[PDB]
Amino acid sequence: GMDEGDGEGNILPIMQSIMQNLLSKDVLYPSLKEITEKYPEWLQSHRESLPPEQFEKYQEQHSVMCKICEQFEAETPTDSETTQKARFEMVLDLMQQLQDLGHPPKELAGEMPPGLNFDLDALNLSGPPGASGEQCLIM
Numbered sequence: 001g002m003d004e005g006d007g008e009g010n011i012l013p014i015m016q017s018i019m020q021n022l023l024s025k026d027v028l029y030p031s032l033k034e035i036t037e038k039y040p041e042w043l044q045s046h047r048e049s050l051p052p053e054q055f056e057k058y059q060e061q062h063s064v065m066c067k068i069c070e071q072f073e074a075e076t077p078t079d080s081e082t083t084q085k086a087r088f089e090m091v092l093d094l095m096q097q098l099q100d101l102g103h104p105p106k107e108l109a110g111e112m113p114p115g116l117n118f119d120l121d122a123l124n125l126s127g128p129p130g131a132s133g134e135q136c137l138i139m
């Protein structure tokens with residue numbers, strides 16, 4: 001037969017579509033909700049080993065992620081279009097802050113498919129490969 005080498009190639013540019021599909025409000029809500037439940041216990045455990053500066057940022061991410069989950073669980077399809085937008089904008093703003101605060105620990109993201117991971121510097125666009133404004137589910 002031929003050489004073994006199928007299944008992988010250049011899914012890189014497609015990954016933003018997959019990432020946007022997965023991290024849509026649909027799945028993003030439960031995924032964030034699960035991590036928010038886990039965040040405090042993780043922090044409490046590593047709190048002794050966690051730098052004061054780092055610990056704080058992680059608390060903000062936990063708090064912000066909670067708000068986002070709260071919004072979706074407190075959302076109704078019966079709300080007006082301006083409400084759908086308003087909650088989204090507020091959530092998006094919160095998302096912008098938390099992504100700027102740092103990514104959650106990989107252990108806490110160990111329920112996500114290894115690859116769609118989130119690097120703070122990459123999120124901060126401090127050192128992006130294209131530098132065009134590559135995002136996750138944002139742009």
Ligand SMILES: *C/C=C(\C)CC/C=C(\C)CCC=C(C)C
Binds near residue numbers: 031095104112118135
């Ligand atoms: C580019 C968009 C970002 C970083 C906002 C969405 C993601 C986060 C906030 C980080 C945690 C999210 C998941 C584990 C889905």
